[PDB]
Each structure stands twice: as C-alpha cells, then as structure tokens.
Amino acid sequence: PALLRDFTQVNWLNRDITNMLQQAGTKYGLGLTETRLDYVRLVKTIVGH
C-alpha cells in the first residue's frame, strides 16, 4: 500500500493514503537509497536497497 497512491478507482481509499503521505510523519520510497555504510570495500561494494 501507498505505492498504489493513484491507481485505484476506490475513491474513498485513495484519500487516507494521500493524507498520511503528506503529514511529514511518514515518507515512502523504494530504490537505491543513501547509506552510512557506503563505499566500504570487501570484495565489491556495499549499497543499500
């Protein structure tokens, strides 16, 4: 959920999702993100997914 932000015809359900992903209390996000443990080499490299 939250990923189906604007893909459901369920008009009511579409509401709360936007409200919760607006109040700055939560932030959804997928993909290659920033990390502390970064560039630390052992064989290749550490990335955070």
Partner 1 sequence: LSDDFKQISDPKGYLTYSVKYEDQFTKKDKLRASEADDRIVGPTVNLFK
Partner 2 sequence: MLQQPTGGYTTLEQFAFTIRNDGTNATPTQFLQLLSYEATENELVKKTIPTPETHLPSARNVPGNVYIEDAITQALFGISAQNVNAHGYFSRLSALALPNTSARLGLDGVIYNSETINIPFYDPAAVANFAATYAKLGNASTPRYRADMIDIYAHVGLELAGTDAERAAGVMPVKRAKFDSWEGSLISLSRDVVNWKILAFLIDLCSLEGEALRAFKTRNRDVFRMMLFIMSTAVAANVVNRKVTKRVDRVLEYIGVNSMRTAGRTATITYDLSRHEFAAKFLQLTFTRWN
Partner 3 sequence: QHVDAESIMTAPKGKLFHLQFMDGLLRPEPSAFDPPASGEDMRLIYPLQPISVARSMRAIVNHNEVDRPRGAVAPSSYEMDTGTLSRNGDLLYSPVA
Q: Which does 28 bind (CB under 5 to 8 A by kind): partner 2, partner 3, partner 1, none?
A: partner 3
Q: Is 18 in the site for partner 1 (CB under 8 A)?
A: no
* Residues whose CB falls within 8 Å of the CB of residue 6, separated by 6 or more in sequence, listed in order: 14
Does 9 contact partner 1 by CB under 8 A? Answer: yes
Residue 28 φ/ψ, nearest 5 degrees: -80, 145
Using CB under 8 A as the binding criterion, the count of chain residues that bind partner 1 stands at: 8
Name the segment binding partner 1 (CB under 8 A); options: 7-15, 18-26, 34-42. Answer: 7-15
